[PDB]
Design a protein around this nucleic acid. Structure first.
Lengths: 296, 170, 127, 51
RNA sequence: AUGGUAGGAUAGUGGCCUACCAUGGUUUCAACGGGUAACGGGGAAUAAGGGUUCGAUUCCGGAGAGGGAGCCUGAGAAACGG
């Protein structure tokens, strides 16, 4: 029983080591995610953006398309390889045929729905199994049956009960705390092709769960930096929160009043209220005095 | 009417100014008693019943030490030339702590002739202070806080204390 | 180097660097007592005195200069839940320039006439 | 230097950043799914006679 | 707002304030935010020699002396004894 218990301990850590390595993909993807939100949104705004640097933009857009399609094929390939090796996909013959096929963008699109649907059936099996496993082991089934049914829902049921409300959680991911404005955003709203910037639908800042994910990163990276060192505990994670909000967009002189403030100070409106024409000359001969100076 | 109270600040989180008390006698943040040079003036301030603070408003001489032999006489002040924490404090010529102020240390020279008997090239000291006994404008800091002591104390700068401070002078 | 401001610093010490014994079973590292940094707010060779409360904990943040953040935590026993639950409250302490302190790095901290409004403790020993 | 050019290279620098790390990740997963175990985990072969 | 050092102020540590630096700190273990006649909590206190768990004991949440503003003496105090 000693060798059977702790062989699973090798399985836990290798799954946990593999857990941390995929967040390194999640770490290194954000500069693509940030710069995608500043791209032009409409079809017409892409064409005006292609006029200024037309030859330079065309190679890079082809270079962006080649690097994206290379990265899209292998990530589907790794997801097929992961679900076969973790017995998620029951059909090995269909999955092994998808690995050897050169796929276009729409075939990688449709295989994404295939791998997510197979993961969905695997998820409702696992989440119902393990929630039953912890509730029987904790002994709370005989003590909490009749009073707290609304809190003691199973983990699969607790998931889908929050999946009743797609509406409110989709109001979450439009929250533009980053103050990111896309290219020709002001032109497209004025032309009717698309202001409180704090909710912006065409801007896709999923930072809210990503900050939770980066909070989930620092919770898991601290627990996985026990032996020597993990992948990235706080390097380029908290900094990635910083530079998108311009580390803090604050000035020390404006804080202390060491910088001038262009705001209305609300008591000092009108005690020393202005006067009539207080120039005892008619101010046009003083313009001659200002043009032709009596010192110059 | 200045406040030294601790509850005026924001919290470590930054709590939003809970407004518990107003000002009492115990947290009496006193005025900044900036001085100047001139004929000596003393204010006696009674705090905590029997503690008599000494506000130095104007001051003309000080007890400044020379550490290489360990002696200090009474020297007439000339004027401040540098302060580390402020720059308009120098132009105001208000002597706070650690301010680098000129003096004409004639009795330091008079002690030197009365202890050695040799002129200053017109057992030994380094050459960078021989640049200004001929000028007669020696540099000294301030050691004690004059606002509560009612006294001016300092020391003459010594070796690397010049070589870091005329670097900060220029 | 050490000289990085507009004023030279040296403690008056009430050997050119007076060793001060902490008490409570502590001893200086040899880097501290033969250093060159002045640092009068450091608990050794300085006017501040270490006494009273002691605590040990794990460094969680060391990003900026001469103070660090220590995560100390306990599996806190909630009586009604009958559950030990881990809770951390990361307190900021001062770090002396005698201990090259990184994250992790179990250390001991104690009160040092608390410096700036949240810095209440100070490092005295690494491990 | 246009703003779109700076955005496209910022994506491009991030796309190859994820391109090399998933090679390392799939390199780890292939070494953890096939029996050619590296020398860092040879003790798992020695501990378990039913590998 | 967080620290560094210096200065002022304090009976005194102190970002309490100021100067010049470094940019940071608290969080899914819940930071910040919505509810409370918080005449409700506090072993605060003996008890009630059976009035079910208290009949009773007290601390209790602040500001002010017509109203802002400043000052004053006392080991006591921004006094309802100026």
């Amino acid at each position: 029983s000693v060798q059977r218990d702790a062989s699973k301990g090798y399985s836990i850590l290798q799954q946990t080591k593999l857990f941390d390595n995929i967040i390194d993909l999640r770490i290194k993807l954000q500069k693509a995610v940030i710069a995608a939100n500043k791209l032009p949104l409409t079809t017409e705004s892409w064409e005006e953006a292609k006029m200024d640097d037309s030859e330079e933009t065309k190679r890079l857009l082809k270079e962006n398309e080649k690097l994206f399609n290379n990265l899209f094929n292998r990530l589907i390939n790794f997801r097929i390889k992961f679900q076969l090796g973790d017995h998620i996909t029951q059909n090995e013959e269909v999955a092994k045929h998808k690995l050897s096929k050169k796929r276009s963008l729409k075939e990688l699109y449709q295989e994404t729905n295939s791998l997510d649907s197979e993961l969905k059936e695997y998820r409702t099996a696992v989440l119902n199994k393990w929630s039953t496993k912890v509730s029987s082991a904790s002994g709370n089934a005989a003590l909490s049956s009749n009073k707290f049914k609304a809190i003691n829902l199973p983990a699969d049921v607790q998931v889908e009960n929050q999946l009743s409300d797609m509406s409110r959680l989709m109001k979450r991911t439009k929250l533009n705390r980053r103050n990111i404005t896309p290219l020709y955003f002001q032109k497209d709203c004025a032309n009717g092709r698309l202001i409180d910037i704090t909710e912006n639908p065409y801007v896709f800042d999923d930072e809210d769960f990503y900050r939770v994910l980066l909070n989930d990163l620092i919770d898991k990276k601290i627990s996985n930096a026990h032996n020597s060192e993990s992948a990235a505990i706080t390097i380029t994670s908290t900094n990635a929160r910083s530079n998108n909000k311009l580390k803090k967009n604050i000035d020390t002189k404006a804080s202390k009043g060491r910088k001038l403030n262009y705001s209305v100070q609300d008591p000092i409106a009108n005690y020393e209220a202005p006067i009539t024409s207080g120039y005892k000359w008619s101010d046009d001969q003083i313009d001659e005095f200002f043009a032709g100076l009596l010192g110059q | 009417g200045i406040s030294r109270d601790s509850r005026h600040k924001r919290s470590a989180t930054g709590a939003k100014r809970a407004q518990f008390r107003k000002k009492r006698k115990f947290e009496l943040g006193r005025q900044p008693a900036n001085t100047k040079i001139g004929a000596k003036r003393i204010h006696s301030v009674r705090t905590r019943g029997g503690n008599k603070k000494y506000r130095a408003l104007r001051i003309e001489t000080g007890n400044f030490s020379w550490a290489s032999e360990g002696i200090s006489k009474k020297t007439r002040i000339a004027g401040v030339v540098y302060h580390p924490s402020n720059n308009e404090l120098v132009r105001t010529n208000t002597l706070t702590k650690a301010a680098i102020v000129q003096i004409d240390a004639t009795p330091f020279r008079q002690w030197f002739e009365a202890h050695y008997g040799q002129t200053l090239g017109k057992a030994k000291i380094e050459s960078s202070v021989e640049s200004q006994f001929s000028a007669g404008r020696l540099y000294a800091c301030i050691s004690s806080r004059p606002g509560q002591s009612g006294r001016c104390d300092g020391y003459i700068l010594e070796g690397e204390e010049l070589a870091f401070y005329l670097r900060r002078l220029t | 180097t050490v000289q990085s401001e507009r004023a030279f610093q040296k403690q008056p010490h009430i050997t050119k660097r007076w060793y001060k014994n902490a008490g409570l079973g502590f001893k200086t590292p040899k880097t501290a007592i033969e250093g060159s940094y002045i640092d009068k707010k450091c608990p050794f060779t300085g006017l501040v005195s270490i006494r009273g409360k002691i605590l040990t904990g794990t460094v969680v943040s060391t990003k900026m200069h001469r103070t660090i953040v220590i995560r100390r935590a306990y599996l806190h026993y909630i009586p009604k839940y009958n559950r030990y639950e881990k809770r951390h409250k990361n307190v900021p302490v001062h770090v002396s320039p005698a201990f090259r302190v990184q994250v992790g790095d179990i250390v001991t901290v104690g009160q040092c006439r608390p410096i700036s409004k949240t810095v209440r403790f100070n490092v005295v020993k690494v491990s | 230097m246009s703003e779109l050019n700076a955005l496209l290279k910022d994506i491009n620098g991030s796309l190859t950043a994820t391109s090399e790390s998933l090679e390392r990740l799939s390199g780890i997963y292939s070494n953890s799914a096939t029996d050619e175990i590296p020398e860092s985990n040879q003790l798992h072969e020695h501990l378990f006679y039913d590998a």
